[PDB]
Amino acid sequence: LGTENLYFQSMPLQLLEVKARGRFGCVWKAQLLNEYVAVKIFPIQDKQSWQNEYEVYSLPGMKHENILQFIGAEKRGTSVDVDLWLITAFHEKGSLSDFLKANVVSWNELCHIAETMARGLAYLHEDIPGLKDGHKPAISHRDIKSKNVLLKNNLTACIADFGLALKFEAGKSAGDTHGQVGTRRYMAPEVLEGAINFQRDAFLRIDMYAMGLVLWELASRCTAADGPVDEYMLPFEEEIGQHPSLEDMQEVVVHKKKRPVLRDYWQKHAGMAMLCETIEECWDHDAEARLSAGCVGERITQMQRLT
Ligand SMILES: N#CCC1C=CC(=Nc2nc(Nc3cc(C4CC4)[nH]n3)c3ccccc3n2)C=C1
Numbered sequence: 447l448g449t450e451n452l453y454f455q456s457m458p459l460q461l462l463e464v465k466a467r468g469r470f471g472c473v474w475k476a477q478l479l480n481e482y483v484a485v486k487i488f489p490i491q492d493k494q495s496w497q498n499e500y501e502v503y504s505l506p507g508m509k510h511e512n513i514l515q516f517i518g519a520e521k522r523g524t525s526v527d528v529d530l531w532l533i534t535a536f537h538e539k540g541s542l543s544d545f546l547k548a549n550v551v552s553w554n555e556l557c558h559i560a561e562t563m564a565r566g567l568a569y570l571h572e573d574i575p576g577l578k579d580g581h582k583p584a585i586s587h588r589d590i591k592s593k594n595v596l597l598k599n600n601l602t603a604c605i606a607d608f609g610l611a612l613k614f615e616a617g618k619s620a621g622d623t624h625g626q627v628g629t630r631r632y633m634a635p636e637v638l639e640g641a642i643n644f645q646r647d648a649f650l651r652i653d654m655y656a657m658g659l660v661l662w663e664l665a666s667r668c669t670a671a672d673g674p675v676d677e678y679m680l681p682f683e684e685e686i687g688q689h690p691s692l693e694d695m696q697e698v699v700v701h702k703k704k705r706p707v708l709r710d711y712w713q714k715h716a717g718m719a720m721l722c723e724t725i726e727e728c729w730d731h732d733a734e735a736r737l738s739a740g741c742v743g744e745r746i747t748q749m750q751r752l753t
Contacts, residue, residue: 512566
């Protein structure tokens, strides 16, 4: 019906349909040449996030099976009417959040999602000298959550949305976060308490806490439970609902030291029991006690091996 195209790097593109996301941005499913892609469009007010994600994707070694594939970024329009675009791969199965809303997962489905997710995050967090494009720094994501995990057609996970991500150079202290913070629900207690001047290992432990919560989401919709699988709920939603204040979260996580419920009947299955243990270690109130992404990946391999 439409013979008119937009153009990106001289290639024709058509917009198909939109989905909302953070900072009043949006993401379109689009067709670039003969493939579907995702075109993220940021208002000029969220230029910082656009620039940050572009910079992150421009770091050495940022191409990985478990990292949402970057296609390109540009400023579009006039001096006065500016749009910011960042294009990535499109995944028809969407985010793990939307997936879990509509589907339960078998034990083997759960392990594959967990393992590929942990791999992506372990790789993000890893400092790697010696790449052809340079030295990859450790990178903290800073907004880990099921909505920022996308699923490929075989349920392979990839980590998405680097608008808040922060690199660390062995040379210096942690750089400018520009006052931007993550999704309240998934914030570690020390973030909720307003502890400041975090350094590398602290940012990584913040991601691992949020990752614990995502692993809980998987567990909560897994058929390996020896019992019913309830309808999907977000972490802490049972306790503080779908739209909590910072004060709601502080009360529930810092003050009451509470976490999403790990049911005993989830632990008959030997794998699940081990999953539950891993979750508990990831979301420990003590950041220093939390498991690294690499260690979590190993744990997931073990659960599988035993089953
Ligand atoms: N960045 C980031 C997080 C995000 C933002 C919006 C989002 N919505 C969404 N995303 C997708 N898929 C998708 C989104 C992206 C890209 C991360 C914007 N790549 N693929 C679908 C696919 C099919 C039905 C519904 C979908 N909804 C899914 C994840």
